[PDB]
Write a sequence for this structure.
C-alpha cells in the first residue's frame, strides 16, 4: 500500500528530529559542566512515571473490575482463611476432646 | 604532575572549607567505630549475666545431679504437689468448661 | 549519519530470506563441503524460480517464510562478537566524564594524558558550538 | 597500554584506611 | 529380563529376592558343620566395625585394619591380605550362591 | 592489530576468490551492479562471505548500503575501529 | 547422506532443547505471576 | 594444541572409563555393585544405556573439536604458550 | 530512665546555635554509646524512675531508635549543603527521638499512647517540609488520617480497660483477660494499621515515596515498629478473643505478603519497591505475632529489630542514586556498577539483608518466625514457601536492575561516592552481623 | 515538570481529543490507540506493542537509548516491566504453541513414572540367599 | 599470535616434550596397571555355574 | 609411633603443644591473683496458690520463680539431649543399643515438660500453669488419663 | 593477516574433498564459485588429514609409555623379583 | 583456646567440643576394650565431674 510508505516516512522524519534533539542535548558541555547530575528531559519517562503512580482517575466500578478484584484478591484470601479455620478447628476438637496422647502430639516446642 | 593544595576534593560532610571536613570526619569516625562498634562490643562481650542463662545451665547441671540421685523425676510434671492442691468436687463445678 | 529506513522492498525481503535460509543451512550442516553442496542446491532452487510475477512471488515468499520457520534449527549458529552471540558486550565502557571526577593525586599518575584531555576539551566545545550551537 | 575509563576509587580507599 | 522375569511367569518355581531358607536346614541329611566365630562381640565393637560388615569372618577384617594402621597411609604393602579378606567374603558369597540354589532344588522336589 | 592496507588486501582477496567476478575488471571503486554483472542474490553471497571472513554480522540495511569494495573497507574499518 | 537430525525434527528438538525445560522455567509459568502482580496494582491496590 | 589436546584426551578417557584411571575406578565400583544388588529393570536400563550415551557424546566432543576438519574463520589466534595456565593444567592433570 | 531523656532535653539548645549541625549527631552517637553501656535489663521492668522504666523489648527498641536517628542526621547532608532550615530540622529530629524514647520506655499503656500519637506530628513536619515532590500533601494526609482514624477508638478501648481493671501498668493489665469483640478490635486495629497489612497499607507506599530520606528512615525504621510494640503489649490480655479472630488477620497477612511480593516485580521506582518490601516482611511479623508462641514473639522482636536497620539502609541507597541521577525511576537507575562500583558492595550487602542472608539477624528472625507459623497450621507451608521465594524474586530485582547491565544513555555528570555515605551504609549493616553475637540479648525479651 | 503536569488525562471520546492526545505523546495519529473504557483500563495513554518483547525489536537499529531499545520522547509501553528484555521476551517467535511443550514434558513424565512404578516389584536379583548375620539365638551352617 | 589461511606458528620444544611426557605418563600408568593387576577388568573371583553342582550332596 | 602418619601427627601435636604450655605455665599461670566466685542460690518464695488475688507482690515473685524454673527445666531437657548426642558420637556403630535408656529418659523429660509448660503460650504466668494443672487434674479425675478420654 | 596470499595459490584440483563436490555438482549440472575460498581449509601439510590426526591424538605417548613400562618392568625384576 | 579454655558447664557461649571414640586395632595398647564411660552422668559432662560444688 502507498499509504504505508508515507506514514513510515513521516515517522522517520519525526524520529530524525527527535534524534537530532537527543544528540544536541546529550553531549551538552555546559550542562555537563554545571556539575549537578541529572538526565536529558524525556517526555515518555515522565508519562510512564505518572502512568505507574496515578491510576485511580481512570477507574470505575464495572463488572470486569469487580470480577478481577474478586478472583484475584478476595477469593484466595477467603479460601485460605476457610482452609486454615477448618484445619485448626479439626485439630482443636481432637485436642479438646482428648483423642491424642501427651507424648504423641506434634510441635511440643521441645 | 604537582597538584595545587587549593584544589582539594571534599569528603561527604562539608562543602565550604577543608577544616570542617577533617574535624567532623575524624570525630564522626570516633563516635561510631571506636566507641559504638569496638568499645561497645568489648563491653557487650564481657557483659554479666543480665539474663540468667549461665545460671540456668549451672542450676540445671546441679539439679540433674541431685534429681537423679533422689530418682523421683528428671523434670517434674506438676507445678505444685498433687496432695496440696484442693480440687473442687463434681457437684461444685456443675457445667464448667474443663480444658485439656 | 544515514539512519536506516523502515520500508523493506520485495527484493530486500527475498534477499533476507535467502540469507536466513543459508544461515539455517549452515547451522544444520556443520561440514563445509556438505554445506557448500546444499547451498548451491538452494541457490539453484532460487535461480529456477526468479522469473515469475510479483503476486506469485509474494505468495511464494510467504510460503518460503513459513517453510524456513518450520525448518529452523533449535540452536542456530551465530557469531560470538556480534549482537545476539554467545559473548556480546561482555564489558561495558563508562563515559569519559568520570575521568574528570578523579582525585588530583590520582590525576597526577597520568599528567600527560590529562593535559591532552584538557587540551581536547576546548576543541570539543568549539566543535559543539560549530555543530549544534 | 590503553587507558581504561574507570571511576574514582580514592574515596573508597580513604574510607577503608580511615576505618 | 531374567531372574525377575521368571518370577513373573513361574513364581512357585523360582524363589524371591534375598529369600531365607524356608525348609529344614537338616532336610538334606548332610549333618553339615556349624560356622563358629573367631572374634567375639567385645573386640568386634572395639575395632568400630560397622553393622553391615560384622560377618562370620570379621577377624580377617580386623587384621586388615591392623595392617592398614601399621603402614598408614601406604596401605598397599599388605594388599594381598585385603584379597584374603575379600576371598572370605567370596567364600561367604559361594555359600549364599549355594543357599539359594539348593532351595530352588528343594522347591523343585516338592513340585 | 590491523591496518587499512591489510583490510584492503582481505577485501580484494575475498572478492577475487569469487569465480563470478573477473579479476581483471575488479577494482576498489568498481560498482557491484552497473560495472560488474551480479545478481541480487550474488551480493548476499558476497555479504555472508565478508561475514564469515571478518567474523561479525552485517545487517540488511548495511548489506544494501554497500555497493563498492572500498565501501566494504570503510564499513569494516569503522566496525573494528582502525584508521591507520 | 541423510541428515538424521533434520529428519525427525520434532524428536530432535525435544532431545536437543534439554527436554523443553528452559522454556518451562523461562517464558513459561512466568507470565502467570508477573501479570497477576499487575492485577493487584490495577484492581485492588489503586482501584478497590 | 598438542599439550592442551593431550590434557583433553586424558580427561575424556578418564570420563569414559579408560581402564585403570580415576573415572574407571569410580564407575566400575558403582556399576558392578548395582549388578549384585536389587535394581529395577528401568533403573538398570537408565545406567548402562546412559553410559553408552556418555561415551557417545564424549567422543563426539572429541570429533568436532579434534581429529576433524577446521571450520573457523580465516583469522585464528591458536597458540600454546600460556604457561601459567598450562602449569595449573599440569597440576590438575597429574592429580586427576 | 531519665539520663537519656534529659540528655536529649539539654541537646535541644544545640539547634539554635549556628554551625552546630554536626555536633548533634556526635552527641547522639555518644548517647547511643552510653545506652550501649546501660544494659542490665531482664524480662521485667528495670531502672524504674517515676513512670519511666525499661525491659529488654524496650531496650532494643530505644537502641534502634537512637541508632536510626543518629544515622538519620548522618544521611541528611542535603539539608546542610543548602540553606534549608537546619535548626528546625535538628529540633524536629531531637523532639521525635525524645518522643520515641518516651513511648518505648513507657511503663503504662496510656503514656505509650500519648507519646505514640505525639510522634506522628514531627513525621508530618518532615514529610511536608523537607520532601522533594508535589504530592507531599497526599503523603502526609494519608498517613495522619489513616493512623488517626483507626487510633481514636483505641483511646475508648484504653479507658474501657482502665475502667474494668483500675490500673494502667502493663503487668497489672497482664493479669486480667477480656472476652469482648469491640475492645479487641479497638486495641488491635490501630496497630494493625501502624504495621502494614495488605488491605490497610495504602499510607505506606504513598508516604515513603514523597517523603525525604529522613522521613523514609523514621517511617520504615521505627514507626512500623510502634504497632509491633503495641501489639506485644496488648495481646497478653486479649488471648482468648485473638485466638478466635486471628486466622482472618494471619490469612490476610500471608496472602497479602504473597500479593505485595508480586507487586514489587511490577514496580518502576527504587523508593516505592522498598516501601512495598516493608509490607512483605512485616506481614511475616504480623503472621508470627498472633500465634502467641515463645518463638513467634521472640522471632517477631528479632525481625523488627533486624528490619528497621535493613529497610532504612536500603532507603539510604535509593537516596544516593536520587541525588545524582536525578530521579527515583528504575529505568534510569541502570548499570551503577560502572558508575559507583564501591557502592555496589553496600547495595548487595543491604539487599541480601532484606532476604535471608547467612550472617544477618534477619535470618535468625525469619527462622524463628517460620517455626511458629508452620507450627500454627500445616497449610501455611504452601504459602510461606511462595512468600519467601517471591521475597528474593523481587529483592534481587532491585539490585540486579539498578546495579547491573548497560548504562543509561543521556545521563549528565554527577559527583562520586563519599566517605560519609560509605560510613552511613557501614552502620546499617555491621549492626546486622554483630548482633548475632550476643543474640540472646536481642531475642529473649521474655 | 512534575507528575501532576505530565500525566494521562480523560479518555478521548471525540476525534479532536484523540488527535491532541496523539500529538501530546509524540506519536503520529494513525499509530496512537487508547485503551478500553473498562475499570482496569487506562485513560488517554497509548497502547503500544504487546506482540513480543524488547528482544524482538531490532538491535541493529541506531537507538538514542541502546538500553530499553527506545528513542528520545518515545512513549513507553504501560506493561514495560512484563514486556522487558529481561522477563518474558523472545528474540524469535517460538516454533510451537505454549501447550505442546508442557504436553510433551508431562507425557514423557507420566510414561516414565508409570513404567517405573509398575516395575517397582520386579527388581532382579542374583542367585543369592539372604545375608546371614550371626545371632546368639539363631545359628547358621556351612556347606563343608 | 595471529595466523591467516595457514597453520599456527611452530610450537616450542617444551610443549611437544610436555605432550609426549603426559601421554607417556598416562599410557605407562595404563599398561603398568594392566601388567600388575590384569584381574580387575575381568572377574576378580570366579563365577561357577549353579547348574553344575551335583544334587546328591544336598537335595 | 606405630605409623609414619601417626608419628607425623605426634610430632605436629608436640610442636603445637609446646609453646602454648610454655606461655600458660610461664606467663599466664604466674601473676594471676586468686579470687572466689560463687554459684547463686535462690530461696523458694511461696508459689502462686499460697497468696491472694488482690496482691501483686506475690504474683511478681511467683512469676519470677516460674520463669527461673522454666529456664532450669529447659536446661534439664537440653543436658538430657546432649547426653544422647554424646552417646551417639561416642558409641558410633552401636548407638542402637546403648542410647536407648538415655533416649527413654529424654522422652520422659519432654513429656513432663509438655505436661507442665506445654500449650501455655508466649505469656506464661505462674497462675496460668496452675490453672492448667487444675484443669488437667480435674480431667484426670473425671475422664481418666488424656489420650483415652471421652 | 600477515603475508596474505594470492588467489593463484588456491586450486580446487589439489584437494579431493572439494573436487568430489565439484564432480557431484557437475553431475547435477551446477557450478560453484566459492570452492577457491575453502582450499586452504583442507591442507595436508599445515593441517594434516583425518587418519594422521587420530594417530596423533589417540596414541600421542604410546611409545614413550611403553618404553617407561619396559623400564618399570626391568627395574621391578631387579628389586621385587 | 580450644585446648585450655574450651566450653565447660559454667558457661554457655564457648565452643563445646565433643569427641568420638578412637578405633582400636591389634598392635595398640589394650585391644580387648569396651566403652570406658557407661554412666548417664559421664555422657556430655563438660567438666561437671570435677566440680567443687
Ligand atoms: C475483604 C476482607 C476479607 C474477607 C475474607 C476474610 C473473612 O472475612 O473471612 C471470614 C469468612 C471465612 O469463611 P469461614 O471459614 O468463616 O466459613 C465457615 C463456613 N462453614 C461453617 C460452612 C464451614 O469469610 C466469608 O465467609 C466470606 C469471605 C469474603 C466474601 C466476599 C467479601 C467481599 C467484600
Ligand atoms: C541497633 C544497633 C545499635 C548499635 C549496635 C552496635 C554494635 C554492637 C554489637 C554488640 C554485640 C557484640 O559484638 O557482642 C560481642 C560478642 C559477645 O559474645 P560473648 O563473647 O559474650 O559470648 C557469649 C554470648 N553468646 C552466648 C551469645 C555466645 O563477642 C563475641 O562473640 C566474641 C567473638 C566475636 C567474633 C569475632 C569478631 C571479629 C574479630
Ligand atoms: C463500630 C463502631 C460503633 C460501635 C458501637 C458499639 C460500642 C459499644 O457500645 O460497646 C459497648 C461494649 C460493652 O460495654 P461495657 O462492657 O461497658 O457494658 C456496660 C453495660 N452498659 C453499657 C449497659 C452500661 O463495649 C465493649 O464491648 C468494649 C469496647 C469499648 C469501646 C467501644 C468503642 C466503639 C468503637 C468500635 C470501633 C471498632 C473499629 C475501630 C477501627 C476502625 C474505625 C472506623
Ligand atoms: C581475636 C579475638 C576475637 C575472636 C575470637 O577468637 O573469638 C572467640 C569466640 C569464642 O570464644 P568465647 O566465646 O569462649 O570467648 C568469649 C568469652 N567471654 C564470653 C568471656 C567474652 O568467638 C568465635 O569463635 C566466633 C565464631 C563465629 C562463628 C560463626 C557465628 C555465626 C553463625 C550464625 C549461624 C546462624 C545464622 C542464623
Ligand atoms: C524412557 C522413555 C524416554 C522417552 C524420551 C524421548 C525419546 C528418547 C528416545 C531414545 C532413543 C533415541 C534413538 C535415536 C532417535 C533420534 C535419532 C537422531 O535424531 O539422530 C541424529 C544424530 C545422528 O545424525 P547425524 O546426521 O549423523 O549427525 C549430524 C547431525 N546430528 O544422532 C546422534 O547424534 C546420536 C543419536 C544416538 C542414538 C542411539 C543411542 C545410543 C545407543 C548406543 C549406546 C548405548 C548402548 C547401550 C547397550 C546396553 C543397554 C542396556
Ligand atoms: C480490614 C479487614 C477487616 C476484617 C474483619 C473480619 C471480621 C469477620 C470475622 C469472621 C469470623 O471470624 O467468622 C467466624 C465465624 C464462625 O465462628 P465460630 O463461632 O467458630 O463458628 C460456629 C461453628 N458452629 O464465621 C462466620 O460467622 C461466617 C462469616 C461469613 C461472612 C460473609 C461475608 C459476605 C460478604
Ligand atoms: C515441572 C517443571 C517445574 C519448573 C519450575 C520452575 C520454577 C521457576 C524457575 C525460575 C524461572 C525464572 O524466573 O527464570 C529466570 C528468568 C530470567 O529471564 P529469562 O526468562 O531467563 O530470559 C529470557 C528472556 N526473558 O526470570 C524471568 O524471566 C522472570 C523474573 C521474575 C520471576 C518471578 C518468579 C516466577 C517463578 C515461577 C512461578 C512458580 C513459583 C513456584 C514457587 C515454589 C516454591 C516452593
Ligand atoms: C531452508 C528453507 C528455505 C525456504 C525457501 C527457500 C527456497 C524456496 C524457493 C524460493 C522461495 C521464494 O519465495 S523465491 C521469491 C519468489 N519470487 C520470485 O522469485 C519470482 C519473481 N520475483 C522477483 O522479483 C525475483 O527476481 C526475486 C528472486 C524475488 C528477486 O531477486 P533477484 O532480483 O532476482
Amino acid at each position: 500500500s502507498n499509504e504505508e510508505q508515507e506514514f513510515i516516512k513521516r515517522k522517520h522524519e519525526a524520529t530524525l528530529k527527535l534524534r537530532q534533539e537527543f544528540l544536541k542535548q546529550s553531549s551538552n558541555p555546559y550542562r555537563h559542566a554545571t556539575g549537578e547530575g541529572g538526565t536529558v528531559f524525556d517526555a515518555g519517562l515522565a508519562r510512564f512515571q505518572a502512568m505507574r503512580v496515578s491510576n485511580y482517575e481512570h477507574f470505575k466500578p464495572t463488572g470486569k473490575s469487580f470480577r478481577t478484584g474478586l478472583f484475584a484478591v478476595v477469593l484466595p484470601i477467603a479460601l485460605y482463611a476457610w482452609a486454615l479455620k477448618a484445619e485448626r478447628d479439626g485439630r482443636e476438637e481432637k485436642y479438646r476432646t482428648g483423642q491424642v496422647a501427651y507424648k504423641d502430639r506434634q510441635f511440643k516446642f521441645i | 604532575a604537582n597538584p595545587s593544595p587549593k584544589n582539594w576534593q571534599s569528603y561527604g560532610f562539608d562543602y565550604k572549607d577543608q577544616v570542617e571536613d577533617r574535624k567532623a570526619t575524624k570525630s564522626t569516625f570516633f563516635v561510631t567505630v571506636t566507641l559504638c562498634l569496638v568499645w561497645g562490643s568489648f563491653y557487650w562481650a564481657y557483659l554479666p549475666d543480665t539474663q540468667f542463662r549461665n545460671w540456668a545451665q549451672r542450676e540445671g547441671f546441679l539439679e540433674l545431679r541431685r534429681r537423679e540421685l533422689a530418682g523421683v523425676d528428671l523434670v517434674s510434671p506438676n507445678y505444685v504437689d498433687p496432695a496440696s492442691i484442693t480440687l473442687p468436687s463434681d457437684e461444685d463445678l456443675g457445667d464448667t468448661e474443663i480444658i485439656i | 549519519a544515514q539512519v536506516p529506513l523502515a520500508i523493506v522492498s520485495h527484493k530486500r525481503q527475498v534477499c533476507s530470506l535467502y540469507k536466513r535460509a543459508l544461515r539455517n543451512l549452515e547451522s544444520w550442516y556443520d561440514r563445509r563441503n556438505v554445506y557448500r553442496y546444499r547451498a548451491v542446491q538452494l541457490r539453484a532452487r532460487f535461480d529456477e524460480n526468479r522469473s515469475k510475477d510479483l503476486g506469485e512471488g509474494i505468495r511464494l515468499l510467504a510460503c518460503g517464510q513459513r517453510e524456513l520457520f518450520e525448518t529452523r534449527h533449535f540452536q542456530p549458529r551465530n557469531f560470538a562478537n556480534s549482537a545476539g552471540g554467545c559473548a556480546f558486550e561482555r564489558e561495558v565502557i563508562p563515559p569519559d566524564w568520570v575521568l574528570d571526577y578523579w582525585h588530583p593525586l590520582e590525576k597526577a599518575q597520568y599528567p600527560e594524558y590529562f593535559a591532552k584531555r584538557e587540551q581536547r576539551k576546548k576543541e570539543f566545545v568549539t566543535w559543539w558550538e560549530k555543530q549544534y550551537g | 597500554h590503553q587507558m581504561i575509563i574507570k571511576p574514582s576509587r580514592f574515596q573508597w580507599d580513604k574510607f577503608k584506611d580511615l576505618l | 529380563m531374567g531372574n525377575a522375569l521368571t518370577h513373573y511367569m513361574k513364581p512357585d518355581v523360582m524363589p524371591g529376592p534375598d529369600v531365607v531358607p524356608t525348609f529344614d536346614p537338616l532336610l538334606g541329611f548332610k549333618s553339615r558343620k556349624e560356622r563358629v566365630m573367631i572374634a567375639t562381640q567385645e573386640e568386634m565393637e572395639s575395632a568400630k566395625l560397622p553393622l553391615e560388615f560384622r560377618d562370620y569372618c570379621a577377624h580377617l577384617a580386623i587384621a586388615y585394619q591392623a595392617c592398614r594402621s601399621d603402614t598408614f597411609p601406604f596401605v598397599y604393602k599388605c594388599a594381598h591380605q585385603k584379597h584374603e579378606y575379600l576371598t572370605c567374603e567370596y567364600e561367604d558369597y559361594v555359600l549364599r550362591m549355594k543357599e539359594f540354589e539348593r532351595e530352588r532344588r528343594l522347591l523343585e522336589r516338592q513340585k | 592489530p590491523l591496518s587499512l592496507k591489510l583490510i584492503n588486501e582481505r577485501v580484494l582477496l575475498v572478492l577475487k576468490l569469487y569465480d563470478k567476478i573477473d579479476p581483471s575488471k575488479l577494482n576498489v571503486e568498481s560498482h557491484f551492479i552497473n560495472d560488474l554483472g551480479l545478481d541480487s542474490l550474488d551480493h548476499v553471497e558476497v555479504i555472508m562471505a565478508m561475514e564469515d571472513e571478518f567474523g561479525f554480522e552485517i545487517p540488511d540495511s548495511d548489506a544494501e548500503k554497500l555497493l563498492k569494495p572500498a565501501d566494504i573497507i570503510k564499513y569494516v574499518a569503522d566496525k573494528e575501529d582502525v584508521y591507520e | 547422506f541423510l541428515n538424521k537430525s533434520l529428519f525427525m525434527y520434532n524428536l530432535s528438538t525435544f532431545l536437543g532443547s534439554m527436554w523443553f525445560m528452559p522454556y518451562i522455567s523461562t517464558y513459561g509459568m512466568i507470565f502467570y505471576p508477573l501479570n497477576y502482580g499487575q492485577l493487584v496494582v490495577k484492581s485492588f491496590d489503586q482501584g478497590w | 594444541m598438542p599439550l592442551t589436546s593431550a590434557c583433553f584426551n586424558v580427561s575424556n578417557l578418564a570420563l569414559c572409563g579408560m581402564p585403570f584411571l580415576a573415572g574407571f575406578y569410580s564407575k566400575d565400583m558403582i556399576l558392578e555393585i548395582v549388578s549384585i544388588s536389587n535394581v529395577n529393570m528401568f533403573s538398570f536400563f537408565l545406567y548402562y544405556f546412559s553410559t553408552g550415551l556418555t561415551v557417545s557424546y564424549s567422543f563426539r566432543l572429541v570429533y568436532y573439536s579434534m581429529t576433524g576438519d577446521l571450520n573457523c574463520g580465516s583469522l585464528n589466534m591458536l597458540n600454546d604458550e600460556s604457561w601459567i595456565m598450562l602449569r595449573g593444567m599440569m597440576g590438575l592433570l597429574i592429580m586427576s | 530512665m531519665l539520663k537519656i531523656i534529659f540528655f536529649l532535653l539539654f541537646l535541644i539548645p544545640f539547634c539554635f546555635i549556628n554551625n552546630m549541625y554536626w555536633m548533634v549527631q556526635i552527641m547522639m552517637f555518644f548517647i547511643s554509646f552510653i545506652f550501649l553501656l546501660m544494659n542490665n535489663f531482664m524480662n521485667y521492668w528495670s531502672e524504674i524512675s517515676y513512670f519511666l522504666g525499661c525491659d529488654m523489648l524496650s531496650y532494643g527498641l530505644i537502641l534502634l531508635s537512637l541508632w536510626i536517628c543518629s544515622l538519620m542526621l548522618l544521611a541528611s547532608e542535603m539539608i546542610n549543603k543548602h540553606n534549608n532550615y537546619k535548626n528546625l530540622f535538628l529540633l524536629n529530629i531531637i523532639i521525635l527521638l525524645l518522643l520515641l524514647i518516651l513511648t518505648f520506655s513507657s511503663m503504662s499503656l496510656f503514656m505509650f499512647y500519648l507519646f505514640f500519637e505525639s510522634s506522628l506530628i514531627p513525621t508530618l513536619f518532615l514529610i511536608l517540609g523537607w520532601g522533594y515532590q508535589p504530592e507531599r500533601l497526599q503523603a502526609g494526609l494519608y498517613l495522619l488520617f489513616y493512623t488517626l482514624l483507626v487510633s481514636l477508638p483505641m483511646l475508648i478501648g484504653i479507658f474501657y480497660v482502665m475502667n474494668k481493671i483500675g490500673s494502667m501498668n502493663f503487668y497489672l493489665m497482664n493479669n486480667f483477660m477480656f472476652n469482648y469483640d469491640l475492645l479487641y478490635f479497638c486495641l488491635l486495629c490501630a496497630f494493625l494499621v501502624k504495621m502494614p497489612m495488605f488491605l490497610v497499607h495504602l499510607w505506606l507506599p504513598k508516604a515513603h515515596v514523597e517523603a525525604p530520606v529522613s522521613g523514609s528512615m523514621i517511617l520504615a525504621g521505627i514507626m512500623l515498629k510502634l504497632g509491633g510494640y503495641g501489639m506485644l503489649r496488648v495481646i497478653s490480655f486479649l488471648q482468648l478473643m485473638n485466638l478466635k479472630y486471628s486466622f482472618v488477620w494471619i490469612s490476610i497477612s500471608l496472602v497479602g505478603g504473597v500479593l505485595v511480593s508480586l507487586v514489587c516485580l511490577r514496580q518502576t521506582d527504587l523508593k516505592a519497591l522498598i516501601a512495598y518490601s516493608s509490607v512483605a516482611h512485616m506481614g511475616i511479623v504480623l503472621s508470627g505475632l498472633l500465634t502467641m508462641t515463645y518463638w513467634g514473639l521472640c522471632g517477631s522482636y528479632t525481625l523488627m529489630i533486624a528490619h528497621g536497620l535493613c529497610s532504612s539502609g536500603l532507603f539510604c541507597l535509593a537516596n544516593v542514586s536520587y541525588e545524582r541521577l536525578g530521579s527515583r525511576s528504575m529505568l534510569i537507575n541502570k548499570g551503577l556498577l560502572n558508575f559507583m562500583p564501591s557502592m555496589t558492595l553496600w547495595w548487595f550487602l543491604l539487599s541480601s539483608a532484606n532476604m535471608a542472608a547467612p550472617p544477618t539477624l534477619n535470618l535468625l528472625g525469619e527462622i524463628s518466625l517460620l517455626n511458629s507459623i508452620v507450627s500454627w497450621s500445616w497449610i501455611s507451608m504452601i504459602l510461606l514457601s511462595f512468600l519467601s521465594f517471591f521475597s528474593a524474586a523481587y529483592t534481587l530485582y532491585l539490585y540486579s536492575f539498578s546495579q547491573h547491565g548497560k548504562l543509561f544513555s543521556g545521563v549528565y555528570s554527577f559527583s562520586s561516592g563519599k566517605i560519609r555515605e560509605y560510613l552511613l551504609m557501614l552502620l546499617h549493616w555491621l549492626p546486622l552481623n554483630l548482633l548475632i553475637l550476643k543474640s540472646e540479648s536481642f531475642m529473649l525479651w521474655l | 515538570g512534575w507528575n501532576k503536569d505530565y500525566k494521562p488525562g480523560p479518555y478521548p471520546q471525540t476525534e479532536k481529543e484523540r488527535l491532541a492526545a496523539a500529538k501530546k505523546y509524540y506519536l503520529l495519529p494513525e499509530e496512537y490507540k487508547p485503551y478500553a473504557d473498562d475499570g482496569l483500563g487506562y485513560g488517554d495513554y497509548p497502547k503500544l506493542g504487546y506482540g513480543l518483547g524488547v528482544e524482538a525489536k531490532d538491535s541493529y537499529y541506531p537507538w538514542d537509548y541502546p538500553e530499553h531499545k527506545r528513542n528520545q520522547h518515545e512513549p513507553i509501553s504501560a506493561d514495560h516491566d512484563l514486556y522487558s528484555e529481561d522477563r518474558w521476551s523472545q528474540a524469535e517467535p517460538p516454533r510451537y504453541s505454549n501447550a505442546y511443550y508442557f504436553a510433551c514434558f508431562l507425557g514423557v513424565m507420566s510414561g516414565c513414572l508409570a513404567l517405573y512404578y509398575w516395575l517397582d516389584d520386579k527388581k532382579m536379583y542374583r542367585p543369592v540367599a539372604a545375608k546371614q548375620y550371626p545371632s546368639p539365638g539363631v545359628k547358621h551352617y556351612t556347606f563343608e | 599470535v595471529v595466523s591467516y589461511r595457514n597453520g599456527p606458528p611452530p610450537h616450542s620444544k617444551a610443549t611437544k616434550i610436555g605432550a609426549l611426557t603426559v601421554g607417556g605418563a598416562m599410557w605407562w600408568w595404563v599398561i603398568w596397571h594392566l601388567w600388575h593387576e590384569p584381574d580387575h577388568i575381568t572377574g576378580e573371583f570366579d563365577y561357577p555355574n549353579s547348574r553344575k553342582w551335583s544334587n546328591t550332596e544336598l537335595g | 609411633p606405630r605409623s609414619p602418619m601417626a608419628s607425623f601427627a605426634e610430632s605436629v601435636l608436640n610442636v603445637i603443644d609446646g609453646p602454648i604450655t610454655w606461655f600458660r605455665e610461664s606467663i599466664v599461670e604466674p601473676n594471676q591473683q586468686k579470687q572466689n566466685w560463687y554459684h547463686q542460690r535462690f530461696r523458694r518464695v511461696p508459689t502462686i496458690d499460697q497468696c491472694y488475688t488482690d496482691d501483686a507482690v506475690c504474683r511478681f515473685e511467683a512469676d519470677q520463680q516460674f520463669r527461673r524454673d522454666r529456664m532450669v527445666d529447659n536446661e534439664i531437657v537440653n543436658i538430657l539431649r546432649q547426653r544422647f548426642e554424646d552417646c551417639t558420637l561416642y558409641e558410633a556403630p552401636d548407638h542402637m543399643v546403648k542410647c536407648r535408656p538415655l533416649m527413654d529418659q529424654y522422652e520422659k523429660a519432654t513429656e513432663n515438660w509438655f505436661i507442665k509448660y506445654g500449650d501455655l503460650g508466649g505469656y506464661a504466668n505462674a497462675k496460668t500453669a496452675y490453672m492448667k494443672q487444675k484443669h488437667r487434674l480435674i480431667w484426670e479425675r473425671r475422664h481418666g488419663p488424656v489420650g483415652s478420654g471421652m | 593477516p600477515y603475508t596474505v596470499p594470492h588467489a593463484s595459490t588456491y586450486k580446487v584440483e589439489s584437494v579431493p574433498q572439494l573436487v568430489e563436490v565439484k564432480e557431484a555438482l557437475g553431475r547435477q549440472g551446477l557450478k560453484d564459485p566459492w570452492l577457491r575460498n575453502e582450499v586452504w581449509r583442507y591442507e595436508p601439510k599445515a593441517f594434516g588429514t583425518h587418519r594422521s590426526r587420530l594417530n596423533t591424538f589417540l596414541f600421542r605417548g604410546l611409545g614413550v609409555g611403553f618404553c617407561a613400562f619396559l623400564a618399570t618392568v626391568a627395574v621391578e625384576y631387579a628389586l621385587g623379583i | 583456646y580450644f585446648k585450655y579454655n574450651q566450653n565447660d558447664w559454667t558457661r554457655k557461649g564457648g565452643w563445646r567440643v565433643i569427641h568420638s571414640r578412637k578405633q582400636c586395632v591389634p598392635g595398640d595398647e589394650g585391644y580387648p576394650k569396651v566403652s570406658d564411660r557407661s554412666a548417664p552422668s559421664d555422657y556430655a559432662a563438660r567438666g561437671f565431674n570435677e566440680s567443687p560444688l
Observations:
- Chain K is about 40% helix and 5% strand.
